[PDB]
Design an enzyme around this catalytic site. Structure first.
Site, PDB file in Angstrom:
ATOM      1  N   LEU A 285       0.773  -1.143   0.000  1.00 33.44           N
ATOM      2  CA  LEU A 285       0.000   0.000   0.000  1.00 33.44           C
ATOM      3  C   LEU A 285       0.857   1.267   0.000  1.00 33.44           C
ATOM      4  CD1 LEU A 285      -1.532   0.116   3.567  1.00 33.44           C
ATOM      5  CD2 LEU A 285       0.552  -1.029   2.904  1.00 33.44           C
ATOM      6  N   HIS A 286       0.263   2.325  -0.540  1.00 33.76           N
ATOM      7  CA  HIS A 286       0.921   3.624  -0.676  1.00 33.76           C
ATOM      8  C   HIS A 286      -0.085   4.718  -0.740  1.00 33.76           C
ATOM      9  CE1 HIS A 286       5.089   5.025  -1.626  1.00 33.76           C
ATOM     10  NE2 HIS A 286       4.494   6.063  -2.180  1.00 33.76           N
ATOM     11  N   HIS A 299      -3.579  -9.885  -3.973  1.00 37.78           N
ATOM     12  CA  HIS A 299      -3.179 -11.090  -4.695  1.00 37.78           C
ATOM     13  C   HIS A 299      -4.340 -12.097  -4.804  1.00 37.78           C
ATOM     14  CE1 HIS A 299       1.300 -10.225  -3.577  1.00 37.78           C
ATOM     15  NE2 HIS A 299       0.792  -9.359  -4.438  1.00 37.78           N
TER      16      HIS A 299
END
Length: 323
Positions: A285-286, A299
């Site tokens: 995450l970002h 995934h």
């Protein structure tokens, strides 16, 4: 009981095997990483088996956030050996990506797709291990996890079952210093900074062991006081993968296999809140810069989503000023 929130997730793109390394560059362009090896390790009975099944080199993709068009930026290979990039960070003084790669070590990747392999060996002179996650401190030093064995041409192995994963610091003088080792699959990594911008705690996920470790940072490649800092819930296959700080220095951690992102306060311990995802395998995450918007890779569907967090993200190194 840990309280749980269930915000709205919006799907941005799909068909990215082993989707990871979400990153924004200095122009606000968004990149993600495709990882056939990640997806393979998910289905294999072993690292070798996983390596054999992996279709090919991974890729860094540019994703247009208006159109969803995916553009291959770089498909790293050196000498017939495909790269397995995982985690990315954008530099501050040049718009270039630093990419941890499980087969090639640390890369620097340009937006036009050329790249440099940064270290064949470390500063003591030992061979380099495959790298997975990285985080810049505000000084420009890059802290890196290395869960794999040696870089290509060594056979591929990963510390999912044995203690051989290492931690590096690639310093602003271009030295690759091994700072710790004998982790069982060190994964996400982050740097907690002081109010004044000074680096002072290193947080490292040890994935299958359901633990987050901390160290006190006293300078470039100088860490001590190694302690278990946080507990990751659940007994599922997986554990903590990527992580990112918010503006309040809460640590959000993808808990791969749990269907949750965990939220830790600044003092660690137990999560103070969990974020329920509409998928079992959040990976990385970002934040979108100057926003509350978190981009998450996963995934189950090899997809990228976004959700709104309660506050803005912490600035990455690339968003800070040289002076």
């Amino acid at each position: 009981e840990i309280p749980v929130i269930e915000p709205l997730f919006t799907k941005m793109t799909e068909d990215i095997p082993g989707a990871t390394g979400p990153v924004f560059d200095k122009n606000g362009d968004f990149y993600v990483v495709a990882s056939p090896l990640s997806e393979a390790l998910t289905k294999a009975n072993s690292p070798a088996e996983a390596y054999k099944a992996s279709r090919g080199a991974g890729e860094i993709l540019h994703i247009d956030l208006k159109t969803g068009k995916k553009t291959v930026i770089c498909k790293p290979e050196v000498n017939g050996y495909g790269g397995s990039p995982i985690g990315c960070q954008c530099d501050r003084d040049a718009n270039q990506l630093f990419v941890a790669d499980m087969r090639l070590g640390l890369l620097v990747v340009q937006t036009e797709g050329t790249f440099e392999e940064i270290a064949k060996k470390d500063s003591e002179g030992r061979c380099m291990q495959g790298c997975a996650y990285c985080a810049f401190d505000y000084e420009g030093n890059l802290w890196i996890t290395a869960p794999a064995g040696g870089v290509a041409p060594a056979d591929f192995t990963i510390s999912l079952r044995e203690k051989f994963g290492s931690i590096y610091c690639f310093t602003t003088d271009g030295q690759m210093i091994q700072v710790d080792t004998a982790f069982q699959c060190p994964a996400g990594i982050a740097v907690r900074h002081m109010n004044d911008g000074r680096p002072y705690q290193l947080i490292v996920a040890e994935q299958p062991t359901k633990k987050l470790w901390s160290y006190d940072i006293k300078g470039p490649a100088n860490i001590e006081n190694k302690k278990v800092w946080g507990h990751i819930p659940g007994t599922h296959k997986g554990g903590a993968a990527g992580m990112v700080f918010d503006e309040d220095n809460n640590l959000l951690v993808a808990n791969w296999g749990s269907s949750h992102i965990e939220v830790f306060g600044p003092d660690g311990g137990q999560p103070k809140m969990r974020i329920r995802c509409p998928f079992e395998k959040p990976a990385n995450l970002h934040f979108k810069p100057q926003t509350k918007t978190i981009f998450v890779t996963e995934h189950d569907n090899n997809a990228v989503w976004k959700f709104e967090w309660q506050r803005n993200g912490k600035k990455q190194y690339c968003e800070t000023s040289k002076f």
